[PDB]
């Protein structure tokens, strides 16, 4: 219409469409370039209408050639939500509601917007699936899907060449890990102290010391710092590994 980017309904499909697109990429990851455009060119041609261009859809394909980054994580993740756990909403700060213009797979700019504390607990980590909150400091309550002894962490973030102008500054940085014995203690235990590297890889692992044999099934992230974002932080996804009780 006018070619104006704005929250319109031409912008609702269309992120629809993307990360549909998205989700049935990775399955050919292992394919040839060649032989991954035909395909998505079957997928559109399942739903949409236009016969879209033999480049056209190969560019869609080199462009969600790099939304991809290895996953390399093989430990159970016992703060995944599928899984049975649980984010405990009056035990996190207020949600900040932010929104990124970015570029989708199609070329055509959109509005990704920040979510709900919920999808810290999800594996879709594409730009804007993280929650915010206001400011450099922040905490997230997660109650696991069983009881484990602690043993481990995982934090992850969005690659830079995705990051809202290619910086990742609203990465935390400096973090704390909280065990609390029931959801009845409000009264944490201090598991371990790390710092996300934003010049590391997307997605890091921590580790606590093995020698408590402490069990728990409620888990605070609490973040100290960011890394120099300052309007918000947020989190694409925070995983939890140990040894089940
Ligand atoms: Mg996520």
Known sequence: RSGLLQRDEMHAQLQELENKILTKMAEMQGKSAREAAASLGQILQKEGIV??????????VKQALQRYSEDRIGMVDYA?????????????????????????????????????????????????????????????????????RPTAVTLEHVPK????????????????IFGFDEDLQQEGTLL??????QDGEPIQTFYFQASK??????????????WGHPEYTCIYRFRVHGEPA
């Open 161 to 176: 060449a995705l990051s809202p102008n290619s910086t990742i500054s609203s990465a935390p940085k400096d973090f704390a």
């Open 80 to 148: 995944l939500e599928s899984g049975g756990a649980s984010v405990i909403s009056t035990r996190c700060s207020e949600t900040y509601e932010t929104k990124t213009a970015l570029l989708s797979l199609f070329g055509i700019p959109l509005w990704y917007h920040s979510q709900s504390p919920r999808v810290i607990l999800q594996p879709d980590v594409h730009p804007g699936n993280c929650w915010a909150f206001q400011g450099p400091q922040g905490f997230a309550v997660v109650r696991l899907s069983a009881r484990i």
């Open 192 to 197: 371990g102290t790390f710092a996300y590297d």
């Open 213 to 226: 044999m402490a069990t728990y099934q409620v888990v605070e992230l609490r973040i100290l710092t960011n």
């Open 51 to 60: 016969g879209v261009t033999e480049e056209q859809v190969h560019r869609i």
